[PDB]
Each structure stands twice: as structure tokens, then as C-alpha cells.
Design a protein that fits this description.
Four copies of one chain form a homotetramer.
Chain A: E1 3-6, E2 10-15, E3 18-22, E4 27-30, E5 37-40, E6 44-47, H1 48-57, E7 61-64, E8 70-76, H2 83-94, H3 96-118, H4 123-131, H5 135-157, H6 167-188, H7 206-229, E9 238-241, E10 244-247, H8 249-264, E11 266-269, E12 274-277, H9 278-293
Parallel strand pairs in A: 1-5, 2-6, 5-7
Antiparallel strand pairs in A: 2-3, 3-4, 7-8, 9-10, 11-12
Helix pairs in contact in A: 2-3, 3-4, 3-5, 3-7, 6-7, 7-8
InterPro entries (chains B, C): CRISPR-assoc_Cas1, CRISPR-assoc_Cas1_C, CRISPR-assoc_Cas1_HMARI/TNEAP, CRISPR-assoc_Cas1_N
Keywords (chains B, C): Antiviral defense, DNA-binding, Endonuclease, Hydrolase, Magnesium, Manganese, Metal-binding, Nuclease
GO biological process, one term (chains B, C): defense response to virus
Chain lengths: 308, 309, 309, 308
């Protein structure tokens, strides 16, 4: 378990070249070598001695408040920088034709994966994408198919779908933020700059937003459907306080355990003739993008259905 | 607009503002803060971070010596500059203009330091049509300066050597250059400019610090070296030679480091501001000029140190 | 085939051969010489040069310490390699193969030094499809090694820092790396390979020395550092820290330099040659492998130091 | 006079950060700062202290023997290197289409300048160049026009033209070598590698051979015609010894003075709205090539006639 999740209130610190979490009930040492990223969901006291240490090991920290609302990320000083790649990233944005191809690829990845999850024909939508030259249009089309899938999510779950006013909306927002953060963490480990995107305007980490479009159906929608239909997540995993409905502590733990188990679940990847983790699919997707920006190979979005 | 934290302590949310404690307890109106830079050891918690996120205020962390460790980026911070930076690189014409500007600044300031007429070389710079050609002209003027450096000091230079420096002068130049690149990079990190995008030097780590330093090296390195040697503050006993390698010793580094820092802290009248600013601030002001240039606001003109006397 | 001049003296034409004098007077059959490398102070004249030109023999000049100064090139010397070098760079597939080879050599030798199983990472290297991806894997294994370096020495590392080194270990790594790049470059200049063309590192000064050094750094730097620290030859008194900068002092440099040179002079049995060669010669042998690779003769395989024990 | 010519037997050495030439009759100090290149035509004693000094100032040394025969050059360690440019130089050679364009441009530059000097129509030859795709053919065509011009050189001078067996052949060889050397010296000052060419095979400094093709008509043919017709060079400036005819000492000095005065003669250069030296035309030609290799501007060979 390379990703570390903190669900208890306490103090996180650097202790003898390792991490230490402590509160009134516990004091555990966590070898910083087995930690690649940290998600924080509780009240935590920390200091620069800790942050400078995490920065040194290249460990991003993601924060979520009482309501499970993602508030921000401690993004460490970059480990590896590539001026060439950076130029190419921006070049593919400045050139309308290059940017269009990428903007479309991300939308296609999103539609294809939503189609796999919701089993709704996307041919009509994919056709519009193939025929337009307007990025704003692509967005419009993607939002149209996304809307269709939300209407179906509501039917397949039986939960009402509309700041989350409903348990389902809470689940969607929580899963989406977890995905945005996880993707951001993967971008950090590469030479890619997280602010240069092609679908979404470059602001906010726009590249994470673009890439997450391809993965959200897998880490969010699909997981939510299974958790609700298999009765893993139910109405007792949510709370409504001051007209604020949110995934609570117990529910948050159920979802995170499911999210992390999915991240670590392996799947056969033809190109490597071996099974890779879902987390690795994100990494591999980033390297496919990099190779595209380097003009070495055309970028094709992950067609998750094809691996199943 | 920007809040700098230079002392160790604790930062937290108190009521609806920020509070710093350590001896001293100070409330800081958050309504004014756009960004917070931390240059000291700090204790904080999620209550503080979530509060900053709610206000859209990023929190930049640096260790005591200025080494950047990372930034807490709010979900929604209240990348245009980056695009503009690369834009002026991709457009060969825009790139060449900036590359020439840094060289012109280097030449103008070497002129002030060495007192070698730059009139003809500045015109030659204007005439070049590519970066390679531009560099050849810079190398020519640079050669005239190193020759004079040998004459005004009486020390051997012969040729610029860096791997490794073959004599005291090259050892001093390398040390001074390093201190200058670091100082400039430090100022860059205090702005929104990405340090990886340069125009004179090839971007392919922090190339922008190299470009901007061209304008300041004559003042922080050449000029200082000449002063220290002629005033007998740096002499032959401040160096150690191993085989073909010459190194500035401990005592030597301290002497130079101290003078460098004192120079950076020295103030000088800045007309446009109608007040005296330190030499470090001149770097910031130079970066501000580059930004306004990249933003299509006002054309970048290199610092003509001599104009400030 | 190649004649090396390592002692000071006079080189001239005598009858129809070469003659070196200084104490000693030696005639050198020119019929055997293809190239002449000079590593000492030499006196000569045009009669000698015209004679070498007539035979088509180039005369390469280096100062006593190995610094290349220039070459007397005959009108007709009796650039194919250069074309082949760039050819393997332009072909992304050929470049990637070479970049992976140097990384594999680095990993194999770090494995021998740190005793950390490289099996999985070597397979990951094989799977990468681009230089950026390849570098990420190298960085991963490198991280495991620096962690162990801290454990087997008890000294702080925390992270690789170079501008400037923030602690003794980084100061030693930077010094050792520098000595290694120089040593490798020196061997490159003794071959016909252009030092500017690399595959792992971006060509855009002497990038090839950087690539090839990846294979030797674990042996000449990491391994030596560990040995010197564990045997108490290099300790805390061999360093000086200024603010955030840590430097290896005079005594420290001498100790390390001496050990480095002694290591390079150490011999080890080389199976394919069925004899013992120095560690410096292993570099030359590695360059020979690269050349035969670039000439489409035999595929380049990095040096697996452990295989030599 | 940045170029230095040594026509007396002696010793050249470094003396107090300057150069010193000495023999039995003289001892002069030459500030190394005013020296950019040195051509040697007499017996000279030298050492590494001198060569390492010249290398430091980036001063190439060209050697010529008793017969005025160019024997070689001391090419110093490069002052400025550019890995990018080097890649681009070889790239334009490896790619048949890129190499063809350059191979043709050099031949065109040669034919156009020979045409200006000899006043012989080259349309027929230029047409063949424009229609072929064979570099060997280009050479064949260039050699054909070159042959025509030699036949005319013989008529316009009245000197017989054929190791130089005739005074005219001696002049041509001497001037050609001086040009090859001078061009090599200009290449040294740039980031260009002298061994990568497009017309001539990359060996020998093939790039100097290519570029010299464009300039030889100006520094050799044209100068020879004027020197002979104006009676500056005559039969007493040559010697025949052991069936070896060569430009002798007095003649060598007449030619070198003429060659150097031409190098320093200025000519109006529209693009700069000012007059530049002929030596600068060589430099400018190299930068035109560099800009072409960098994919910034198409390379067009110097049309000397156009500046007159």
C-alpha cells in the first residue's frame, strides 16, 4: 500500500528519517519509503520539518475537510524537470490543430469509458466529436453524454440525483476529487507540468482535470454502482448537518478502502504481456501523452472496456 | 498583497483572520493577503490550510536558506504567464529579441565595469540574425574583458576554464557566477515565472536564471573580483591548487561570500521609483520588466547599471 | 599504431624516421605510427610537421594534465564515426536502446555496490518506451541506493543536492562525479568519438562523457565513498559548511583524489583479454564496445562490473 | 590586419602574454590580441607552450612548405560547441532531400561566381543542376563549367595551363589552398563542425571544401587574372627546381599581399546597409548556413556579382 490515508485526528511528523502519526490513542511509525502519496481526511497538526521531509521524498499531500470536501494539495518541489518536454506541452496547446487532437482524445476517452460503465450507445456522440473543430463544442457534447449517464446512474442505484444535497451527489463529488488528486500525484512523478492542458483551459491543475476525464468513469461511477448495488455503501454512510449532506467517517472509510483496492487491483495489459495495477494505467497513460508531445507516437486514450 | 513569514513560529486561524505566534502574537488580516511565502520553520494545522483554501491563498514553503520545498495549492487559487513564456521562445523572432536584450545588458554592464567602449559591439549585436551569431559577438566582447581583467589584477586567466578552474581567477569567476545564479533563481521563485523557460540559453535546469544573470554577473562578479583583488582583500593565500585544479579555500569563500552579500544589500537610487533600492531588488525589478514584456505590456529593456552610476 | 609521448623533450625528423630527445635519444619508425598523442611539453619545427603531413599522421596536443589544446591535421589524414554517432541519436529506436544500455549498466553496478536486487527494475527498464519513462525508473532505483547509502554510513543525504551540496555526502558525490566525468572524457579524447553526441542525456557540452559515466559512477564514486567513510579515511573533519553550502576541504580532496587515482590504476582480470587491465582501461574498453556498436559490428552491452568480481 | 603571415625563417613563441618572432636578423613582439589566424610559409621552430597559448586565444595556424604547398593546419580546441547544431548538420546530410538542396546550392554558388569572373554563360549548366537529383551529377556539371573557365583563364592570361608543372597551375593551387585554409579558420570561429559537408563526401575538412567552392572564384581566379594582366605577377615570381615549378618567395609575397588586401577590402552589403570586408562575407555565409540548418531560413549561396 504505497498510498497512505489518514482518517484519524492527530499530528503527523518526521521522526528519525521516518513518519510518525500520533494522537491520544496511538503512536505509530510509518517507514516513509513505503509511502508515495498521502490523503488527509481528519484534523492534522504538522510543521515545515515534516513538509520539507515529504518534499525530499517526493510525497504529495492531499487535504479534505470535515465534509469530505477536497481543499487543496501540498505539491512538492518537482523531482525531475525537462525544459524540452515543457516546451512541447505548451506547443501542443498553442497550435490549434495539435490542441484539437488532444482535446478530442480526452473527450473520446471519457465517452468510451462512460459507455463501458453505463452500457449506453455513444456512437451518436462520438460522431459529433469526430465532426467538430470547436473545443467548446467537444465540451458541450461530452457534457451531453455525461448528463445521459447521470440520469442512468440515478435509475440503476435508486438514489436521487440533483454543494451535495443528496448522498449520490456526495459520492460522485468525493470520488471525482479523489481521482483528480490521485492523477495529480501521478503527474508529479513525471516530467509533465500539471498546469498545461488541452481540453480544459490552462486555469488549478488543468492537466489533472483533462486526464481524470478518462479515468473517473472507472474509479468513480463504476465503483459507486457496485458499492450501492452490493450494499457496501448505504444511507447510514451519509449525514446531513445544517442542510449539508456529506459522506461521513464510516462511509468515507468504506469508499476509500474500495477506491484503494481498485487502485491496487491488477489487470492484463497486452502491450506488456503481464497484469498491471490500475494505478499503473494512469502512469502509462501519462507516458503515452509524453510520447505524443515528443512527436514519437500518436496518443490514443485508454479504452478500458478493451482490457476487460 | 503578498505576505512574507521570515521568523519561526506558529501560523493559525484565529476568528476570521490569520495569526502568527512565537514572544510575539500578531493577527494578520486575511482580506489583504493574496499569497503567503514562508522562509522559516513553521508549525500549522489543517484548520489553517482549509481556511487558506477557502480564501484561495497559496502557501509557499522555503527552508531558512531559501531552498524551495513545495507549495500548498488551494483547490481554487484566486497558468497564463507560463504559456506566454514559451510563446516568446517558439517564435524565433521573439526569442532572438529577448536573447539579444540579455546580451546587451551584459555588454553594457561589462562596459561600465571594464571601461571598454561597447559602441561597435552593441551595433554588431543589433545586426545578428540568429542565436549562434549573437553568441559569437558576445564571446568577442567577453574576450576583451578577460584580457583587461588580467591586466587590472596581474593574475593569470588565459582562458575561461570551468571543469575544473585552472587558476585563481577562474575559481573566483565560477564561485561568483554560482552565487549569482542562485540569487537570481531565488528572486524568480518569488514571482510566477517558471525558471525553466529561457531564450538565450537552451531551456533543455533553471535556464531562466542563467539568462537574467547575464545582466547582473558583470556587477556581482567581475566588478567585485576586481575590487577585492585591487584592495588586497582576496590574495594568493586564499586559493589551493591540486594537480590542475584550483580551489577557493574556506577563508577565501567567507571573504567573497561576505562581500557578495554586502553588495546585494547595498542600496542605490532608482529614478523611476524616486527612492533607493538594494541590489537584490534590482533583480526583482528586472524580472518585473520581463513579465510586463511577456504580457505584451511594455517592451523589455535590460538594466543599464551605469545609468544608475 | 598510435604513439604516445609522455615525457618532455624534442620531436624531429631524423633521416626518414621520427626522433625524440631530452638524457635520451630515441628513433621512432614512422612506418608504424598512425597517430601521435602528446601529453608533455614538446619542442618541434615545421620540418617535423611537414614530414608528418607527408605520412598522413595527425599530431594531437594535450597539456601535462590531459587538457586537450588542439591537433595538427595533415592536409590529407590517412568523419564516418561522427555521422554514425548522430545516426543512432536521430533514430528514436536506436537512441532509446543506447540510453537503456547505459541505465542498465548503472543499475547493474549500483546493484553490485549496494547489494539491492535489481531484477525487477532491470525488467522495468526493458519495458519503458521513451527516455522520460526510462529516467523515471532509473530515479526509482537511484532512490533505493541513496537510502541505503545513508544507512551504511550513518551520514545525512536526504535528497541529492548540487547547487549547492547541502551536506558532506552530496559534497562527496559531486566531487566524485566530477572526477569521473573528467576521467571518462579523457578516454573519449583518445578515441575518434565526438564527445558532444549522447543518447541518454540531451546533446544540447561533452554529453557523451555523461552517458558513459553512468556505467562507472557506482564503482568510482558510490563504492569509494562507502569504503572511505566505513574505513574512517574520510570523516566529518574533512568538510566545511558555509550557510547552506557544504564543501570538501583541502585535506578531504587530497584523500579522495588519491584514492580515486589509486582505484583507476588498480588492475582486475579481464576474461575476454585473458589478462589484468586497470580500471582506466575498462573505460577505454567500454568506449570500444560503443564504437563497434555504432559501426554495426557487435551490439553494445554495458559493463557488468560484478561479473569481474 | 588580423591575419598574420610569416614569410621568414625563425622561431615563434609565447613571450609575456604575447607572441614573439625571432631569427638572426630580428626580434619582434606581436600582440596576440591583434592576431586571429596565422599562415606559415617558412621554416619555423615552435613548442607546446606556444601552441597551448594560440589554442587559448582561438588562433588556428596553417602551414605551407618550401614549394608553397599547403601541408596542414593546427586546429585548436573548439571555443564554442553546440550539440544541437551538430545534430542538425548531420541531419541535413543523412536526409537525401536536405543534402541535395545544400549540395546544389554550393554548386550554384560556384557556377554563378565563376560566371561573374569569366563572363561565360552558365544558364545551360544551371539548368542541368536544377534538373538533376544526383549529387555525383552536380559534381560532374560543376567540373564541366569549371573546365570551361580554366580554358578561358589560359586565354585571358596568355599563360599555359596544364604537382604544378606550369606557373599558372601553381598560382591556382596556391590560391585554392589559401582559400581552403581561410575558410577553415572562419569555420573554427563558429559553432559549425568542419567535417560535415553536403556536396563533397564527409572525408580532411569537407565543410571547408564545400564553402570554399563559393569563394574560390573571388579570392583565386579573379585575383590571378588581375595580378597577371596588371603585370603584378610575372614569370620571375616562379621557379622550377627538379622539374618542380612553384610560386617562389618574392612571388608568394606579392600574391599574399594581394590576397590579404582583398580579404580586408570592404564592399556594400544591402542587408546591413553598410560595407563589410570580404572576410566578413565568408563569416556571413557560414551564418546563413547555420540559420538554414536550424530550420530558420533557407540558404541561398553568395551571388558575388550582385554586390558589384
Amino acid at each position: 500500500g504505497r498510498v497512505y490515508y489518514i482518517n484519524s485526528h492527530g499530528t503527523l511528523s518526521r521522526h528519525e528519517n521516518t513518519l510518525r502519526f500520533e494522537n491520544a490513542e496511538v503512536k505509530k511509525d510509518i517507514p516513509v519509503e513505503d509511502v508515495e502519496e498521502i490523503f488527509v481526511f481528519a484534523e492534522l497538526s504538522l510543521n515545515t520539518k515534516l513538509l520539507n521531509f515529504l518534499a525530499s521524498k517526493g510525497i504529495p499531500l492531499h487535504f479534505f475537510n470535515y465534509y469530505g470536501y477536497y481543499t487543496g494539495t501540498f505539491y512538492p518541489r518537482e523531482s525531475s524537470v525537462s525544459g524540452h518536454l515543457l516546451i512541447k506541452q505548451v506547443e501542443h496547446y498553442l497550435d490549434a490543430q495539435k490542441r484539437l487532437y488532444l482535446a478530442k482524445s480526452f473527450v473520446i476517452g471519457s465517452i468510451l469509458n462512460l459507455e463501458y460503465v453505463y452500457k449506453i450507445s455513444a456512437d451518436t456522440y462520438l460522431n459529433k466529436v469526430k465532426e467538430t473543430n470547436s473545443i467548446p463544442e467537444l465540451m458541450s457534447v461530452e457534457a451531453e453524454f455525461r448528463k445521459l449517464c447521470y440520469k442512468k446512474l440515478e435509475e440503476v442505484t435508486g438514489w436521487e440525483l440533483e454543494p451535495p444535497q443528496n448522498p449520490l451527489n456526495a459520492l460522485i463529488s468525493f470520488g471525482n476529487s479523489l481521482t483528480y488528486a490521485k492523477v495529480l500525484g501521478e503527474i508529479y512523478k513525471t516530467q509533465l507540468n500539471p498546469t498545461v492542458s488541452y481540453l480544459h483551459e490552462p486555469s488549478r491543475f488543468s492537466l489533472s482535470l483533462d486526464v481524470a476525464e478518462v479515468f473517473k468513469p472507472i474509479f468513480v461511477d463504476n465503483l459507486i454502482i457496485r458499492l450501492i448495488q452490493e450494499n457496501k455503501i448505504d444511507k447510514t454512510h451519509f449525514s446531513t448537518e445544517l442542510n449539508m449532506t456529506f459522506l461521513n467517517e464510516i462511509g468515507r472509510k468504506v469508499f476509500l478502502k474500495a477506491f484503494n483496492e481498485l487502485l491496487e487491483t491488477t489487470i492484463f495489459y497486452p502491450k506488456l504481456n503481464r497484469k498491471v495495477s490500475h494505478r499503473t494505467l494512469i502512469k502509462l497513460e501519462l507516458y503515452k501523452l509524453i510520447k505524443h508531445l515528443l512527436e514519437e507516437e500518436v496518443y490514443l486514450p485508454l479504452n478500458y472496456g478493451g482490457l476487460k
